[PDB]
Symmetry: C3
C-alpha cells in the first residue's frame, strides 16, 4: 500500500494574549501562510497499483481529510472523504498513453503554495480521459460535479414554490498542455464551461446566472533551478463566484416562508473576472532559495458587489546548513470594494527558524519556530447581519455593523510542523 498525504500542526501564542490568531485581509481570498496557520489539517492517502500487465495498469487512490482546531488532545471531527477513484493507463489502444478515470479525484489542481491559493481546481466526483498525445501537446477532457445548496424550486404560481432541492453544477473541461513556445518555456491552455443542471420539474429562481465560461493560459519557464509561472484567466458569470473552474449557477438564491414559500429574486454573479498571476520558486546561488507571488484579481459584477484585489509577497530562504535555515515572508494585500469604493490593506512580516528534510525551500517535513507581525487598515467590511455575513459592504465608519477589523496590528509566535509525503 502507498501512503501519501499532507499535514500541518502546531502551537502558537498571540502577543497580546491567548492562543495564536491568524491574519487575513477582509475581502481577500487568501493569506500569506508562514506562521499564519491556525489549524491542524491532514490528508491521509492510501492507494495501490492493483493490476499491471505489460504497459497497462490500474491504480486505485483514496483520500480522507481531517481539520481540527488544535485546542485539545481529544478533538472529534467529521472527516471529508475527498478521493476514491481508479485510473487505467494505456487501456485504449488507439489513444496510446492516455489514462481513463472515474471517481472522486483531485484533478490537475494548480495553486500558489505560499498563499495556499488554488486558481484552477475543478476537483470532485468526475470522469475523463487525460494525456491524449497530439504530438505537439497533450489533450485532456473531463467532466466533474459540484452542488449548491437549494436553488432549485418546484414553482406552483410564479415565485411561490412547493419544494426546494440542491442544484447540481456540471463542468466540462478541456486542456492542451506541453506547447513548447520557447526554449525552456511551455504553455498550457484550458477552457471550462459550467452550468446549473436542474432536475425535471424544478427551476432556478428569477435572475440566476445559470452558466459561464473560464479560460486559462499558463506559461511555465524553467530557470534558476526552479520555475516561473505566468497565468492569465478570464471567467464569466456562473464561473466568477468560486473562480477556479467550478460553476455556481444558482449563486445568490434565497427564499422565505410564511406556509407559502417564496423564492426571492437571485442576487446573481453575472459579470466577469480577470486574474493575472505570476509566481515562482528559484535558487539564487548556494545559500538562497526564493518563492514569490504577484497577483491582480478583479471580480466585476454587474450588480457592483465585487472586489479588486492586489497581492504581492516574497519568501526568501537562507541556508545556514543543509538542514537548517532562516525564512522570511513578507506579504501585502490590498482589496477595493466594488460597491463602496473603499480599500482594505494588510502587510505581514514573518521570521522563522527552520529544520527541514533537505536543502530546498520545497523540502518537507519542516519544523519551524516563528514570529509574525501583521498591521492592517480596513476601511470597509461586509455587513454583518447579526451573525451571518452579507454580500453587501459598508464603510467601517458608517455606523453599520460589518466584519471589518479596523485599523490595528498584532504579533504572534509559536512552533509548527508541515509535511507532504
Amino acid at each position: 500500500v502507498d501512503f501519501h498525504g499532507y499535514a500541518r500542526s502546531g502551537i502558537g501564542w498571540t502577543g497580546s494574549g491567548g492562543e495564536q490568531q491568524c491574519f487575513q485581509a477582509t475581502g481577500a481570498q487568501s493569506k500569506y501562510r508562514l506562521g499564519n496557520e491556525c489549524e491542524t489539517y491532514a490528508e491521509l492517502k492510501l492507494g495501490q497499483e492493483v493490476w499491471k500487465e505489460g504497459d497497462k495498469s490500474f491504480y486505485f487512490d483514496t483520500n480522507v481529510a481531517y481539520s481540527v482546531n488544535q485546542q485539545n488532545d481529544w478533538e472529534s471531527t467529521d472527516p471529508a472523504f475527498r478521493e476514491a477513484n481508479v485510473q487505467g493507463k494505456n487501456l485504449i489502444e488507439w489513444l496510446p498513453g492516455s489514462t481513463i478515470w472515474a471517481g472522486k479525484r483531485f484533478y490537475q489542481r494548480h495553486d500558489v503554495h505560499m498563499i495556499d491559493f488554488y486558481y484552477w481546481d475543478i476537483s470532485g466526483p468526475g470522469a475523463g480521459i487525460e494525456n491524449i498525445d497530439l504530438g505537439f501537446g497533450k489533450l485532456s477532457l473531463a467532466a466533474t460535479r459540484s452542488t449548491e445548496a437549494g436553488g432549485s424550486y418546484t414553482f406552483s404560481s410564479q415565485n411561490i414554490y412547493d419544494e426546494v432541492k440542491d442544484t447540481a453544477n456540471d463542468v466540462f473541461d478541456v486542456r492542451l498542455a506541453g506547447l513548447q513556445t520557447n526554449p525552456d518555456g511551455v504553455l498550457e491552455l484550458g477552457v471550462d464551461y459550467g452550468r446549473a443542471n436542474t432536475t425535471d420539474g424544478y427551476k432556478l429562481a428569477d435572475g440566476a446566472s445559470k452558466d459561464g465560461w473560464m479560460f486559462t493560459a499558463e506559461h511555465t519557464q524553467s530557470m534558476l533551478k526552479g520555475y516561473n509561472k505566468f497565468v492569465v484567466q478570464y471567467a464569466t458569470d456562473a464561473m466568477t463566484t468560486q473562480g477556479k473552474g467550478q460553476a455556481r449557477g444558482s449563486d445568490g438564491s434565497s427564499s422565505f416562508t410564511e406556509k407559502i414559500n417564496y423564492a426571492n429574486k437571485v442576487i446573481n454573479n453575472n459579470g466577469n473576472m480577470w486574474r493575472i498571476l505570476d509566481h515562482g520558486a528559484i535558487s539564487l546561488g548556494d545559500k538562497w532559495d526564493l518563492m514569490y507571488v504577484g497577483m491582480y484579481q478583479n471580480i466585476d459584477w454587474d450588480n457592483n458587489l465585487g472586489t479588486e484585489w492586489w497581492t504581492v509577497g516574497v519568501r526568501p530562504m537562507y541556508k545556514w546548513t543543509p538542514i537548517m535555515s532562516t525564512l522570511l515572508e513578507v506579504g501585502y494585500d490590498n482589496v477595493k470594494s466594488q460597491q463602496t469604493g473603499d480599500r482594505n490593506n494588510q502587510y505581514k512580516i514573518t521570521l522563522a527558524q527552520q529544520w527541514q528534510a533537505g536543502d530546498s525551500i520545497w523540502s518537507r517535513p519542516a519544523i519551524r519556530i516563528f514570529a509574525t507581525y501583521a498591521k492592517w487598515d480596513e476601511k470597509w467590511g461586509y455587513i454583518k447581519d447579526g451573525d451571518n455575513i452579507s454580500r453587501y459592504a459598508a464603510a467601517t465608519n458608517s455606523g453599520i455593523s460589518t466584519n471589518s477589523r479596523g485599523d490595528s496590528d498584532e504579533w504572534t509566535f509559536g512552533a509548527q510542523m508541515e509535511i507532504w509525503w
Copy 2:
C-alpha cells in the same frame, strides 16, 4: 499491513435533467445495481497477522466505512467503524483447525452481488468458534448482537412508563457446511435463534414479538467454471423484519408523552417469511460470462402488513478483448402489498461498456460508461405520514399520500468505477 476493501464512485446524469437518479421498486428490498448506484461507498480495511508460531496464529482486522453523496469535493461524513476483531487459528488443541474470535466482524455473509442483497448476515459485535472439523463437514458456532432504538420501558402503571432504553437482540448461530451431497455439489445448513434481551427492570411493550427462528439451507453446485447456489430460508416472528438472521424482537414499538409517558401497543412482526433464491455466475464459452438471480420472498405478517416479492434478472458479459467488454443487465421486480393486494412492478435495462482488470465478470477494478432505462408502474405505496413513511400502505389512487412513484419511466447515463481489493 494488509490493505483491503471495497469502493464505488462515479458521476451520472438523468435524461430529463440534473444528477443521476436510481431506481428501486417501492416494496422491494433491493435493486439491480449496474448503472443504478447513486453514492460513493468505500470500506478501508487495514489488518495484519500479528503473531505466528507453527500452525498457530493471530490475525487482527479492522474496517472503516464511508458513504458520501458524490455531489462535491469536500464531503464530510461520520464513518462507521464496522470491524475490529482478532482471530486465533489452531489454538484449541482438541479442536484442530478451528478458529476462535471476538470483536466486531462481518461474519460469514452470503449475498447476491448483482442486486447487492445480503440474505444471511448476522454481522456485528460477537464471538464464536468456527471451522470445527466433524469429518463429514465443518461446524461453526457464533453469538452476535444488534440493538433496536427504544423498546424497553420501566412501566410504573399500565402502559405508563418512567424510562425508555434501547433493546439488545442476541442471535445464536449454528452452521454445518461442506456436506457433499452429490458430485461437485455441497450443502450448508444453518439455524439462528434470536431474542430481545431486556435489562432488569425494563420490559417490552404489549404486542412485541420478542424472539424468532430462521433456518437456511444453501446448495452450491460447481459448473461452467462458476457456480449455482440454491437457497431456501424460513424465518419466524422477530426474524422477519431484518430477514437475514438478526433479531428485531421489539420491532413496532412506539410511545407518546403528554408528561405521562405511554408505550403504545407494539405493531409487531409476528408471522413468517419464506425465501427461495437461486443465483449464480458461469462462463458460456470464451466470450461470455453470465450472472443471474431468481428470487421469491414472502413476508406473511399476522397484521397483514407484509409483502410478496418476485425478482428476476440476468447480466451477460461479452468479452471483446481480455480487458474490454460490454455488459447488459435486465432486471424485473414485482411486489404485492399484503395489506392492499396491489402490485408494484419495475423493469430496468442497462447497457455498459467496461474496462476491467481481468477477463472475468468478477474482475475488479472496472471502469464503466453506461445508459440505464427504467419503467415502472406502482399501484401502491407506503402512507407517507408527512415526511416519515408508515408501515401502512394505500393504493396510489386512493387520495392518501403515499411514497408510490406512480406510472412512469426514466433513463440515466454516466461513468463509474467499482473495485474490491
Copy 3:
C-alpha cells in the same frame, strides 16, 4: 508505512438481563478493567520515517481514534484526530541525541494498565525538545495546550459581559529522567506549571484559580523480570481538576442570560492534590505473572467539594500453556466525599480464561472469556440536577436526587479481544 495502535472489542451479558454493564465506584476516577469494559475503542496509527541521513532522521506519526458502543454492525461516529506530529532526531549538533518535535502528540504518558488510569498525561498540541543528555540524566522540555469551554468574558460592567470565549490553558513541562539512585533503581523528576491564558479584552470571572503547579517523582525498580514503580505527586489549584498535568484554570465558571449576560462567580478548584501510587508487573516463577496497584489520592479543595480515594487491586496470571492462561482480577475502591464525609465502596472479582500471543501478562492480542461480579455500597452521590450531574454531593438517604448506585451487586460475562501492535 508503520501501522500501530490499540483496540478492544467484545460482546457481553448482564446476569440479570440485557447487554453487559460496567461497574465503577461513584467518585472514583477509574475502574478495574478486566471483564469490565463496555465499548469498542480503537486507535489506528500510520507513521513513517520520512527522511534519514546518517544519525539524523525525521519521523512522521498520526493517530485516529474511534469509540463505538458495540451495539450494532453499522455504528457511525466522529473520530478523534489525536496525533499528527514530526520528530527530528539529532538535528541540533550541540545537543547530541536530543529530539525536537512539533504537532499533536501523546507526550511521555504514564499510566497504570489494569485500571486504565493515566497519572501523568499532558498530551495535546505542543512542541518541545526531549532527551537532552546531562550525563547523569536526560532533560526534556515541552509546552502543550488544552482548552476549556467558555471561561473568558468581555465584561462591560461588573459581571455583565458581551461575549464569552473558550479559555486556552498552557502547560510548561520539565522532566529529568534516568537518575541512577540504587542498583536497578532509577528516578524521574518532573515539574509542571500551567495557567489560563486569556485573549486580550477577555477576562476570567471572579474567583478563577487561573494557574497551578504539579510535581512528580517516579522511581522504577527492575526486579522479578518486571518492575515496580513508586509515584508521588502533588498538584496545586488549577492542576487539581484534570490531575494529570493539564491545567483547568477557569474550571467552575458559568453564566446566565436574561438579554443581559451574567458571569457567575467561579466555583474554583483552589486546593491541592496528593497522589501516592505504587504499581507493578512481575513474574513469580514459570507459571505466574502478577500485576498490582495500590493508590491513595486526596483532592482537598478549599470549597470542600473534593474526594479522598483508596484503590487496591491485584491481577495474577496462571500459565497453563504458553498461549493459554487463567486470569483473576480483584479490585477494591473506597471514596470519601470531602463535602458530606460519606464513603462509597466497591469490590469486583473477575475470572477469565485467555488465549494470548505469548506467555506474558503483557502479551497481546488476547482473546478472553470472563465472568465478573461486583458488589457496591454507595452512601453518597453527586446531586443529579435533572439530567446533568452537579459538583455537589448528597447522602443517598437524604431525599435529594443523586447519581448514587445504592447498595447492590451484579455479575456479567462475555468474550472480548484486546490488542496493541
